[PDB]
Structure formats: structure tokens, C-alpha cells
Amino acid sequence: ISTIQPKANFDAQQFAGTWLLVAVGSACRFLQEQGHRAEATTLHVAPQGTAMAVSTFRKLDGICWQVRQLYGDTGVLGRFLLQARDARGAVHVVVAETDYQSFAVLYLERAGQLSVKLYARSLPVSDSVLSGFEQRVQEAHLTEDQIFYFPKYGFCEAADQFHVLDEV
Amino acid sequence: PGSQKAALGYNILTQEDAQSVYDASYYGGQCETVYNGEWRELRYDSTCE
After folding, report:
1. With an 8 Å Cβ cutoff, are A88 and B49 in contact?
2. Which of the residues A118, A125, A140, B20 has an alpha carbon 20 to 30 A from that of B32?
3. Residue A164 CB: number of other CB atoms within 10 A?
4. Which Cys pairs are S-S linked (chain A)?
């Protein structure tokens, strides 16, 4: 395990805005166990100094939900920490790779438990990008059997006042 | 949580709680437990989805 290199000169202002989650690679059981109902997710992203706010949007049983989180910077460009809010333990984050207008591959890790997630500005992703993601997975020592996709449709926006987790 | 108020004495003349009458914390060595029907609290795990 190591902190891999981020996007060179990561521009939070360009990486800002709307991302759709496309696929996740992880050894996390709950993507393979109960891997059905991988409900679609999207981020709104804003810079907030060097930290970034993120609003994940999701459905849950058809109720649209918003989770707002601060990705605190590590003091290092493109490197962030999520807090141990519920004693979950802090999650290290690296913006490994992005075309700010097109695609991103984000590295996230806690307690050596590692995930990589591929987001896009777009419904399609270039198959070359997807292939890069596959090799990113292999380099992370994750199997193809630990890659999981998310549906093309049914993204949500603007969850209700009562359906915002607002963990911060 | 909030069991201590039931332990307090009550002043009918003022409708104010007094000092504790019951021991709010003595268990008599029993482990007798109550199911909290509202235990469900959402969590999110960004390391998964």
C-alpha cells in the first residue's frame, strides 16, 4: 500500500461540478455480497479552500438521498482525508487521474482496505479510460472479480431537506 | 437515556423536580435490557458504496 501519484497540478476549480459514478473496484464485501441494487450515484463538487465539499446523491428504496462531506486536504495538493465521523476511521483520498472535463479515477483507502472509483462527466466512458481503470485495479492487486459497474440511468439530484445526511 | 428524570422526586406545590428518590443507576447485578425500536441511524461508507 502506498499513496500513488495524483493528477499533476490538480485544479480543484476544474475538477469541480458534476460527476457521475460509473464503476467501483474494491475488495469490499458489500459490492460482491448483495451486489444487486448498486443504485446510481452522482457528486456535486465544490472547492471550499483547499478542502472540497462533496454532495453525493443516491436513491435508497426510491427515496432520493444526499450525503454532504468535506474532503479535508492533507496539506498536499490532490490529497485529502475524510474524518472518522462515526468512528469509521479516516479515509485517505487521492485524485489519481482525471480529465476534469471528461473522466476521473479516484483512490480511496482505509486501514489498507482500498477502493478505486471511476467517475465521468458523461454517460459513456472511453474504453481506453475503462481499460486504464482495469490496469489501475490490477496494480492495486484487485481482481477483475472485484470490479463492479453502476447503471446508466436513474441518477438523482436535490434530495429533500429530510433526506440529507449532512455528516460534514 | 432520560431514565434519571423518572428517578426524581416531585413537589406538587411547585411542579418542580426535587432531589433523586430512586437510584437511577443501581442494577442489582441484573443485565436486563430494553429494545430501542428507533435504533436505525443512517451511515455512509465512502470506501464502499
Report:
1. no
2. B20
3. 16
4. 64-156
DSSP β-bridge partners for residue A54: A45, A69
In degrees, rounded to 5, the angle at the alpha carbon of residue A77 between the alpha carbons of residues A18 and A68 is: 40
Resolution reached, in Å?
3.3
What CA–CA distances, in Å, run from A92 to A53, A70, A159? Answer: 15, 12, 27
A41 vs B: CB within 8 A: yes
Alpha helices by DSSP H, chain A? 12-15, 29-32, 127-139
Q: Smallest Cβ distance to B44: which of A24, A31, A165? A: A165
Q: Around Cβ A8, how many Cβ atoms within 10 Å?
A: 10
Q: Is the distance from CB of A77 to CB of B33 less than 8 angstroms? A: no
Q: Are A31 and A24 in contact (CB under 8 A)?
A: yes
Closest chain A CA to residue B48 = A28
Of the CA atoms within 13 Å of residue A38, those in its CB half-sphere come to: 19
CA distances from A35 to A28, A120, A147, A149 (A): 11, 21, 11, 10
Task: Give chain B positions within 8 Å (CB) of A113.
Answer: 47
